[PDB]
Design a protein. Sequence first.
Lengths: 313, 313
Amino acid sequence: MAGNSIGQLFRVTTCGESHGVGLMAIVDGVPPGLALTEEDLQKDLDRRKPGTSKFATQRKEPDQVEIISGVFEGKTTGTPIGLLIRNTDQKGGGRSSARETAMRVAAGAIAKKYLAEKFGVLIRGHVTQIGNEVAEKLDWNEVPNNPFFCGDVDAVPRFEALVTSLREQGTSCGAKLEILAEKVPVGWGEPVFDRLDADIAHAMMSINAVKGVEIGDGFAVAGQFGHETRDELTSHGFLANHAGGILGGISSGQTIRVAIALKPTAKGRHDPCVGVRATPIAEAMLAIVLMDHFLRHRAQNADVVPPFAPIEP
Amino acid sequence: MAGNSIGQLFRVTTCGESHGVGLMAIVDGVPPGLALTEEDLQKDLDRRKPGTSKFATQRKEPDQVEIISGVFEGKTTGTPIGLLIRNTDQKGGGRSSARETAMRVAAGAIAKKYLAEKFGVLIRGHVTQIGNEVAEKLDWNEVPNNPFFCGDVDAVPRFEALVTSLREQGTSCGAKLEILAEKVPVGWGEPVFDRLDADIAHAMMSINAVKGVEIGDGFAVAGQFGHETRDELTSHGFLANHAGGILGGISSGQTIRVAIALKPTAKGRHDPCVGVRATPIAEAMLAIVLMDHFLRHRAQNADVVPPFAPIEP
């Protein structure tokens, strides 16, 4: 069955079998005035498989999302937004689990686009590891350039070789993704039980191969020592973002760092690392949580008193 | 300034400031007929101090939980159960935060008893690592013999040396705890968004200082390769809980394995590794989610029927 809803104020409620007739979502709480169209959503959808009709050799135009309510004349009305995908599962039956993820990613798209305009929040994820290959550096312009979402232009070949290797031998490997949210206003999160890190973990943990979630330095913290605050020299600065942007479960101000670990996954099926495909959904999940908490934080302000630096519309 | 509640069927709602008059919870959803008095709760509350006789230079009584409603003649009636702790702030000297943690432990104590009596579920935690010291073996008998919740009697010496140093040096260190849930029935959890692992993670992260949560093999999984090897005479059995007792977001029937990483914090009240005192609260939170998913699982179906299982009173 299903626990098919997520969010208090930004709410996504869904349904649909991968083999069923179609897939649906109702998304509540998105304020009126947001330019929004189907294309905005597909573009994130189609990001899940980074091919055009290019990617799978003879693949069709993919199944397309349709906005059924909530948008008037290109803009959000501020009523509940309905999404539909009709499954053109072309007329033992298998199942492709990109259909099971669609509604999340279409909804996250809505929360991304809203948070980018309003705040310039930018939510982006990259695979740091596949099995025994690690990326060692980050270049945002590189992650779209290779089919692993890898920020390290020199590991891409090494990742590529490991994928080529596994394919040969009827195996598959684990993955670790990092997702970041930047330009996130301070103060979001709801201790005790709805800390921003908690909802994040909750949300990420809805993705299927996930075995862990961490925030900031995450697990390394186990081995660390409390050597961060009392004495400085003249130059130094302790913005290492050890907390990964959440402290006491409310946003810092700093970028938000979350990592997750996806496990290995069971004609030639080119399996081998389905985990990299989780990036756009991991990005989706984070957006959905931040939007929810945006709305909660606003609902708890009689009205605003900044603070806001030289302004950066 | 709170999101002060957790659960859908087993629901726990709280309030109380540490220097407020008192602390309260209202716990919803416990079936009638569980044997319950204040003592079943203090035992758990008083476990935040592995030694209560074992204290630095003086100890108060301490502070006693009172059950306000939902029990008759020693038994849950099935009505919401009210809990209160009146702060004897005493009307400085010694100040502790054990207070923001009490209603959680008290309510976990309840979930825990019900699970223990009904399904014989066993939820215990142990500290696997403090700073640079790691414990190797687990002997449940050891766990309450030391003040570290440590299951390895050869690590106790080392943990003691480490902590004794750090306190005189004035340094704090992080910890890593493992919490286990044994004899948990198969079936529990609610995908897509309320998977058991998602709600575990969510809950673990309400504990301050947690920077990571992992299920089963957890972060090891990024570096792993996949198959159920193999077809030959010796090959590894599926029940090595790689999954830590959750599959596709629902309990497997295997033991539930959860690890969390807690970061270092910052007269003789110096907390070098407060992380170890989090063990009872991680037990409570795991009990609270389990209890919740039990009821939700009951609610889902009209008729329970085999497997025969172990449902042991």
